[PDB]
Design an enzyme around this catalytic site. Sequence first.
Site, short mmCIF file in Angstrom:
data_model
loop_
_atom_site.label_atom_id
_atom_site.label_comp_id
_atom_site.label_asym_id
_atom_site.label_seq_id
_atom_site.Cartn_x
_atom_site.Cartn_y
_atom_site.Cartn_z
N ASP A 178 -1.67 2.71 -9.82
CA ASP A 178 -1.79 2.55 -8.37
C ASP A 178 -2.36 3.80 -7.70
OD1 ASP A 178 0.45 1.17 -5.80
OD2 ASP A 178 -1.63 1.89 -5.74
N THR A 179 -3.67 3.80 -7.47
CA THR A 179 -4.32 4.91 -6.78
C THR A 179 -3.88 5.08 -5.32
OG1 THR A 179 -6.25 3.52 -6.20
CG2 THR A 179 -6.37 4.84 -8.23
N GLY A 180 -3.31 4.04 -4.72
CA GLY A 180 -2.80 4.12 -3.35
C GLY A 180 -1.40 4.72 -3.23
C1 LIG Z 1 1.15 2.48 3.06
C2 LIG Z 1 0.62 3.70 2.34
C3 LIG Z 1 -0.39 3.35 1.24
C4 LIG Z 1 0.06 2.32 0.19
C5 LIG Z 1 1.26 2.84 -0.60
N1 LIG Z 1 1.82 1.76 -1.42
C6 LIG Z 1 1.10 1.55 -2.69
C7 LIG Z 1 0.34 0.21 -2.62
O1 LIG Z 1 -0.65 0.22 -3.65
C8 LIG Z 1 1.25 -1.02 -2.75
C9 LIG Z 1 1.82 -1.21 -4.16
C10 LIG Z 1 2.74 -2.41 -4.20
C11 LIG Z 1 4.02 -2.35 -3.67
C12 LIG Z 1 4.86 -3.46 -3.71
C13 LIG Z 1 4.40 -4.65 -4.27
C14 LIG Z 1 3.12 -4.72 -4.80
C15 LIG Z 1 2.30 -3.60 -4.77
N2 LIG Z 1 0.56 -2.23 -2.35
C16 LIG Z 1 0.76 -2.96 -1.25
O2 LIG Z 1 1.54 -2.69 -0.35
C17 LIG Z 1 -0.06 -4.21 -1.18
N3 LIG Z 1 0.68 -5.39 -1.62
C18 LIG Z 1 0.29 -6.10 -2.66
C19 LIG Z 1 1.14 -7.31 -2.93
O3 LIG Z 1 -0.70 -5.82 -3.35
C20 LIG Z 1 -0.68 -4.46 0.19
C21 LIG Z 1 -1.47 -3.23 0.61
C22 LIG Z 1 -1.55 -5.72 0.18
S1 LIG Z 1 3.42 1.89 -1.62
O4 LIG Z 1 3.76 1.02 -2.72
O5 LIG Z 1 4.05 1.45 -0.42
C23 LIG Z 1 3.85 3.41 -2.00
C24 LIG Z 1 3.84 3.77 -3.34
C25 LIG Z 1 4.17 5.06 -3.74
C26 LIG Z 1 4.53 6.02 -2.80
N4 LIG Z 1 4.87 7.33 -2.96
C27 LIG Z 1 5.17 7.94 -1.79
S2 LIG Z 1 5.03 6.93 -0.38
C28 LIG Z 1 4.56 5.69 -1.45
C29 LIG Z 1 4.21 4.39 -1.05
#
Ligand SMILES: CCCCCN(C[C@@H](O)[C@H](Cc1ccccc1)NC(=O)[C@@H](NC(C)=O)C(C)C)S(=O)(=O)c1ccc2ncsc2c1
Lengths: 99, 99
Positions: free
Chosen positions: B25-27
Amino acid sequence: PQITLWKRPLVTIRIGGQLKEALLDTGADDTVLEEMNLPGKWKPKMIGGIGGFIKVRQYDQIPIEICGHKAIGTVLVGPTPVNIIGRNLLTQIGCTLNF
Amino acid sequence: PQITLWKRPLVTIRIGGQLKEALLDTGADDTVLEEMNLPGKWKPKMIGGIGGFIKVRQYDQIPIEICGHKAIGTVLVGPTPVNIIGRNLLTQIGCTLNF
Ligand SMILES: CCCCCN(C[C@@H](O)[C@H](Cc1ccccc1)NC(=O)[C@@H](NC(C)=O)C(C)C)S(=O)(=O)c1ccc2ncsc2c1
């Protein structure tokens, strides 16, 4: 480009004629941008992640230029904490993970 | 290897010599694992995601293997729906985004 991950992979995007910074997010199924105006009809949708679910507006077939690479796809708009480029568009620009 | 993004980039990781499936997860700034009863001291922390914050337990200097690549660092444990490998570990395995 090749992008390392010591910093957040933020890039400039162009959408509806405006410049924004967005996160290249391999952990995101969908592309979600902070509240903004886009032309066309949207559909109400909900998406979830860490912390729970939010309500978004789904816009379909929206052109976005990401770091000089064109995509045209689904863009969700709502109260996301950051502009997120997700897998639906990352695939369009030929983005992969490598190690 | 090279990982395309047509589907979620899920890979096998090892923590405590135990295998789990996790999202590259690059995000994600940090690494966030689903609830597990890890030994050792920890600190409480709050991390923010799309829908708000969750409470996590921060464990430091935890060895993890990601696709047979050794890493060691901070792992956050809490009620995430998916195991998330964040940039803190991705950098250690030489992972890049490329397009
Ligand atoms: C809001 C800031 C940027 C995104 C951060 N998210 C990672 C992200 O890739 C998550 C990773 C993730 C979390 C929970 C379920 C699925 C994926 N994906 C999603 O929320 C997506 N959801 C799906 C279903 O893909 C959305 C954007 C459509 S995160 O998961 O909320 C996250 C991860 C690690 C971390 N470390 C310190 S704060 C922090 C926040």
